Structures are given as structure tokens and as C-alpha cells.
Enzyme design. Structure first.
Site, PDB file in Angstrom:
ATOM      1  N   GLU A 282       0.848  -1.159   0.000  1.00 18.84           N
ATOM      2  CA  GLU A 282       0.000   0.000   0.000  1.00 18.84           C
ATOM      3  C   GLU A 282       0.887   1.212   0.000  1.00 18.84           C
ATOM      4  OE1 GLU A 282      -2.945  -0.171   3.160  1.00 18.84           O
ATOM      5  OE2 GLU A 282      -3.929   1.670   2.396  1.00 18.84           O
TER       6      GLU A 282
ATOM      7  N   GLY B 260      -8.618   5.427   6.120  1.00 20.36           N
ATOM      8  CA  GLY B 260      -9.573   5.347   7.203  1.00 20.36           C
ATOM      9  C   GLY B 260      -9.125   4.391   8.318  1.00 20.36           C
ATOM     10  N   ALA B 261      -8.353   3.350   8.015  1.00 18.55           N
ATOM     11  CA  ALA B 261      -8.000   2.332   9.054  1.00 18.55           C
ATOM     12  C   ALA B 261      -6.489   2.174   9.203  1.00 18.55           C
ATOM     13  CB  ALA B 261      -8.626   0.975   8.734  1.00 18.55           C
ATOM     14  N   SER B 262      -5.690   2.600   8.232  1.00 15.60           N
ATOM     15  CA  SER B 262      -4.213   2.671   8.468  1.00 15.60           C
ATOM     16  C   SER B 262      -3.629   3.945   7.853  1.00 15.60           C
ATOM     17  CB  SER B 262      -3.459   1.455   7.928  1.00 15.60           C
ATOM     18  OG  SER B 262      -3.558   1.498   6.515  1.00 15.60           O
ATOM     19  N   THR B 263      -2.386   4.247   8.218  1.00 20.06           N
ATOM     20  CA  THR B 263      -1.710   5.371   7.549  1.00 20.06           C
ATOM     21  C   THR B 263      -0.280   4.880   7.169  1.00 20.06           C
ATOM     22  OG1 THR B 263      -1.157   7.788   7.604  1.00 20.06           O
ATOM     23  CG2 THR B 263      -0.710   6.480   9.537  1.00 20.06           C
ATOM     24  N   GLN B 264       0.256   5.323   6.020  1.00 19.70           N
ATOM     25  CA  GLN B 264       1.571   4.812   5.491  1.00 19.70           C
ATOM     26  C   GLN B 264       2.501   6.007   5.340  1.00 19.70           C
ATOM     27  OE1 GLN B 264      -1.252   2.346   5.437  1.00 19.70           O
ATOM     28  NE2 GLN B 264      -1.571   3.536   3.573  1.00 19.70           N
TER      29      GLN B 264
HETATM   30  N1  LIG Z   1     -14.284  15.225   2.313  1.00 22.25           N
HETATM   31  C1  LIG Z   1     -13.582  14.641   3.341  1.00 22.25           C
HETATM   32  N2  LIG Z   1     -13.190  15.297   4.504  1.00 22.25           N
HETATM   33  C2  LIG Z   1     -12.473  14.656   5.493  1.00 22.25           C
HETATM   34  N3  LIG Z   1     -12.155  13.337   5.325  1.00 22.25           N
HETATM   35  C3  LIG Z   1     -12.539  12.640   4.167  1.00 22.25           C
HETATM   36  C4  LIG Z   1     -13.260  13.293   3.151  1.00 22.25           C
HETATM   37  N4  LIG Z   1     -13.520  12.415   2.124  1.00 22.25           N
HETATM   38  C5  LIG Z   1     -12.977  11.220   2.475  1.00 22.25           C
HETATM   39  N5  LIG Z   1     -12.396  11.363   3.709  1.00 22.25           N
HETATM   40  C6  LIG Z   1     -11.686  10.275   4.449  1.00 22.25           C
HETATM   41  O1  LIG Z   1     -10.536   9.744   3.741  1.00 22.25           O
HETATM   42  C7  LIG Z   1     -10.305   8.399   4.176  1.00 22.25           C
HETATM   43  C8  LIG Z   1     -10.133   7.487   2.949  1.00 22.25           C
HETATM   44  O2  LIG Z   1      -9.792   6.151   3.462  1.00 22.25           O
HETATM   45  P1  LIG Z   1     -10.041   4.639   2.848  1.00 22.25           P
HETATM   46  O3  LIG Z   1      -9.353   4.534   1.451  1.00 22.25           O
HETATM   47  O4  LIG Z   1     -11.498   4.211   2.792  1.00 22.25           O
HETATM   48  N6  LIG Z   1      -9.304   3.615   4.188  1.00 22.25           N
HETATM   49  P2  LIG Z   1      -7.957   2.537   4.027  1.00 22.25           P
HETATM   50  O5  LIG Z   1      -8.419   1.110   3.726  1.00 22.25           O
HETATM   51  O6  LIG Z   1      -7.019   3.135   3.023  1.00 22.25           O
HETATM   52  O7  LIG Z   1      -7.200   2.509   5.351  1.00 22.25           O
HETATM   53  C9  LIG Z   1     -11.567   8.008   4.996  1.00 22.25           C
HETATM   54  O8  LIG Z   1     -11.370   8.142   6.406  1.00 22.25           O
HETATM   55  C10 LIG Z   1     -12.598   9.051   4.610  1.00 22.25           C
HETATM   56  O9  LIG Z   1     -13.671   9.214   5.558  1.00 22.25           O
HETATM   57 CA   LIG Z   2      -7.002   4.124   1.019  1.00 17.39          CA
END
Ligand SMILES: Nc1ncnc2c1ncn2[C@@H]1O[C@H](COP(=O)(O)NP(=O)(O)O)[C@@H](O)[C@H]1O
Ligand SMILES: [Ca+2]
Length: 419
Positions: A130, A169-173
Site C-alpha cells: 500500500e 480510514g483504518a491505516s496510515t503509510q
Molecule cells: N471530504 C472529506 N473530509 C475529510 N475526510 C474525508 C473526506 N472524504 C474522504 N475522507 C476520508 O478519507 C479516508 C479514505 O480512506 P479509505 O481509502 O477508505 N481507508 P484505508 O483502507 O485506506 O485505510 C476516509 O477516512 C474518509 O472518511
Molecule cells: Ca485508502
């Protein structure tokens, strides 16, 4: 020029996005040649949110797959590769229930095989994949892998590459090229791209994505305060405890409780600081939680929720974020707003609004105390979600790798002129 196409479904923890890429048939190996042709956002949750109802995981993709049939020319459907890659949502679900994980993966596979594209598999990426594929994406689109100069006068040192920080949303890299000695093989990456060797560091912090951090701060607030110092004064909600504590990220920490915000930036800071264990380092140098990390260096792009959060701060709050000290001030000011004051800045829909304070504060701590940016290194960080008309993320780099579109070496080794 005859175009080829490729499709990646990015099955993230909070949503699925589909990306369609196109490139000319006879220039396909040039760097920076592949670009995004279109994209589609799947409605509703990520595929892991269907753990208890796996057939809906496949169904959820249909609207976007119908769009792909209209986006990619019909004579080209059959030879367009399609991939699904799933990230920390599915990694967390695999901890809880490998059986439910396999059934979700089987349901999306079954839906995808019904389509006429060359379907190449649904897989869970590792955290390393990732991080590295997002780094490849950013640097491929910005043409950082070209060897600059000409015979007898090559630029030295070679062109720097852009580090990548991805807040999902669930990890950070965090992933960047480094000349530091590797002390942990789990973080060490070597790439051979267009004849060049890149020594790269990468790490993925599972449970440090935005939505899992917001859950951990809620559990923590419930336990220590019984009010939420990061939420704005006058905002309250009915918290379902089973939802708070079912995540593998929070089961570490009455069915319904009322919880209200207090707009207390200082207690919010204290709450977020508990997320980072800095007490112990078995390496010569760590980021946090005992994780090896060499000093951050070079430019970085911070995308996904880093971008969305900073864009809220600059565009809605109207606040500058060019220095760590500005970002920290923007956070305090945001966290000190009451619910009516915050709501008066956002005339339209308010979902996520109560959370910006907590996420901004987490981002500021993650960078300054997690990764050890300071004013000097932070100045090299840009918050952006697009490069050359293509969304920045891991999908493009994933597709490039699986389709073999980045050669390890140039043709004929370019007569050895790069030796
Ligand atoms: N408009 C927005 N303002 C603040 N946060 C926003 C947003 N649109 C998406 N996001 C956030 O970005 C993140 C995208 O993560 P994902 O690709 O769903 N999670 P992962 O499997 O890579 O770990 C989410 O937390 C989502 O709620
Ligand atoms: Ca993602």
C-alpha cells in the site's frame, strides 16, 4: 494512436473507488505515460462493512462496473485488465474472521468475473504494498524516474523523489527514499525502475487511519472524561458502545451513552498525544510505538485524509497551514469553536464536521511527534490529491506493477550510456 486501458478497484476501509487508466499501445513503457481516464465512487461502505452480508459486497460494485463498460470502448473490454486490491478494512476483518474475509473476497470475485474485462483477481494488499505503490504512483506521474541531463553531463545527485504519506480510514503509510542504513527488514524496500536502484523506507500503521483514530479517541474520552474535549461545545450524540469497542483497534480500551463536546483544545491535545508511545526504541532511532524510522528527508506529498483535512482548514476555516506552528494554531482555533460557530462556517452538509478538530490535531501530532518533522523538513511537504489529472493513491502503481508497465531496465540498457 491506439489506446489501451486498465481498471483498478481500490477497496478501502470506508469506500470503494474505481479508476480507469489509459495509455498509448506503443509508448506504454515510457514513465508518466499512463493516466487516469475516469473514475467512479461506489455508494455506501467499504467491502469489509459487508462482513455479515457478503453478497452485498459484490452487488455494491455493479453501478461502477456498468460505468466502466461505457468508459472503456467496447472493442477493448476483453483485453482490459481489471484488479481489485483491498486495504486495512480487509486487513482488520482478517484479524477478526478469516472466514468472513474469504466470503467477502469470494462475493466480489463472483461479481467481477461476470464482466467482460480481463479480470485478474481480488487481493488484500500488505501495508508495505500500500505504501510503496502510492510512492510509485506519485513519482511516476511527476516523472521523477527520468534520468535528467544528457551524455557527459548528468545531473548529480540524481533527481530527488517525492515521499508519500497516505492517511486512509483504518491505516496510515509513510514511504520515502532514504540513504540511511536499514535496521528492520520489514521496513526496507529496493526498487529497480528504468535502470535505477531506489532504496526506500516504508511503514504502515494499522489502526492509525482517520476513522480508527476517531474511534480510539471516542473510547478514550468515554473512559477518562465522560465528555469529548475534541468535539465542539453544544454538539452531542448517542454513542452505541458495541460499535465503539468491536474494532480490533479499540477492544484494547450500558448499550447507549450520551456524549457531548467541550471545545477544549488543550484536553483534545492531551487525548491525541496518548496515541503515540514514545517510551521505547529498540533501534537507533524510531518514529513511534517502537517502530524503526530514519530521519524524514526530501519533498513529500500528503494525500487522502491529510489533503481533505488541510483543505478544510485553509478553505473553510480560512486559516494558513504553511508551517507546523500555523497548522498547530489552526488546530487550536478549530477545536475552540463551538458547535454553532463551526456550523455557521459550513452552510451545506455537516457530516464529518464535528471530527475536523480531532483529525487535524492527530495529523499535527503524527507529523511532529510521530514522524519527527520539524519546521525545516515540513516546509518540503505539499498537501495535494491529484498529479497530472490523476488521483494520487496506490491504485496506479499497483496496476503498473501487475501489468508490468515499468521496466526494471531500459531497452538495450540504453547502449549503457547511463552506467
Ligand atoms: N471530504 C472529506 N473530509 C475529510 N475526510 C474525508 C473526506 N472524504 C474522504 N475522507 C476520508 O478519507 C479516508 C479514505 O480512506 P479509505 O481509502 O477508505 N481507508 P484505508 O483502507 O485506506 O485505510 C476516509 O477516512 C474518509 O472518511
Ligand atoms: Ca485508502
Amino acid at each position: 494512436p491506439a489506446l489501451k486501458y486498465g481498471i483498478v478497484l481500490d477497496a478501502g476501509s470506508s469506500h470503494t473507488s474505481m479508476f480507469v487508466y489509459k495509455w498509448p499501445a506503443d509508448k506504454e513503457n515510457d514513465t508518466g505515460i499512463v493516466g487516469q481516464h475516469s473514475s467512479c465512487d461506489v455508494q455506501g461502505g467499504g467491502i469489509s462493512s459487508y462482513a455479515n452480508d457478503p453478497s452485498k459486497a459484490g452487488q455494491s460494485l455493479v453501478r461502477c462496473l456498468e460505468q466502466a463498460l461505457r468508459d472503456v470502448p467496447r472493442d477493448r473490454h476483453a483485453s482490459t485488465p481489471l484488479y481489485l486490491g483491498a486495504t486495512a478494512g480487509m486487513r482488520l476483518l482478517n484479524l477478526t474472521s478469516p472466514e468472513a474475509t474469504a466470503r467477502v473476497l469470494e462475493a466480489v470475485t463472483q461479481t467481477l468475473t461476470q464482466y467482460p474485462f480481463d479480470f485478474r483477481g481480488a487481493r488484500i494488499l500488505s501495508g508495505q504494498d500500500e505504501g510503496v505503490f502510492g510512492w510509485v504512483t506519485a513519482n511516476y506521474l511527476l516523472e521523477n524516474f527520468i534520468k535528467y541531463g544528457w551524455v557527459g553531463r548528468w545531473i548529480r545527485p540524481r533527481k530527488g523523489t517525492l515521499g508519500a504519506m497516505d492517511l486512509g480510514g483504518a491505516s496510515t503509510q509513510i514511504t520515502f527514499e532514504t540513504t540511511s542504513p536499514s535496521e528492520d527488514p520489514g521496513n526496507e524496500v529496493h526498487l529497480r525502475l528504468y535502470g535505477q536502484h531506489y532504496r526506500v523506507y516504508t511503514h504502515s500503521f494499522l489502526c492509525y487511519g482517520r476513522d480508527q483514530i476517531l474511534l480510539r479517541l471516542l473510547a478514550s474520552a468515554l473512559q477518562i472524561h465522560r465528555f469529548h474535549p475534541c468535539w465542539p461545545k453544544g454538539y452531542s450524540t448517542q454513542v452505541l458502545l458495541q460499535e465503539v469497542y468491536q474494532s480490533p483497534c479499540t477492544m484494547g480500551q450500558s448499550a447507549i451513552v450520551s456524549l457531548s463536546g467541550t471545545s477544549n483544545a488543550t484536553l483534545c491535545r492531551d487525548l491525541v498525544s496518548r496515541l503515540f508511545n514514545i517510551s521505547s526504541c529498540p533501534f537507533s532511532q524510531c518514529s513511534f510505538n517502537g517502530v524503526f524510522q530514519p530521519p524524514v528527508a526530501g519533498n513529500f506529498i500528503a494525500f487522502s485524509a491529510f489533503y481533505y483535512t488541510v483543505d478544510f482548514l485553509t478553505t473553510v476555516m480560512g486559516l494558513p497551514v504553511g508551517t507546523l506552528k500555523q497548522l498547530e494554531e489552526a488546530t487550536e482555533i478549530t477545536c475552540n469553536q463551538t458547535w454553532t460557530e463551526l456550523q455557521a462556517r459550513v452552510p451545506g452538509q455537516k457530516t464529518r464536521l464535528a471530527d475536523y478538530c480531532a483529525v487535524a490535531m492527530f495529523i499535527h501530532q503524527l507529523l511532529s511527534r510521530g514522524y519527527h518533522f520539524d519546521e525545516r523538513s515540513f516546509r518540503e511537504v505539499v498537501f495535494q490529491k491529484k498529479a497530472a489529472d490523476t488521483a494520487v493513491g496506490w491504485a496506479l502503481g499497483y496496476m503498473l506493477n501487475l501489468t508490468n508497465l515499468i521496466p526494471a531496465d531500459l531497452p538495450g540498457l540504453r547502449k549503457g550510456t547511463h552506467f
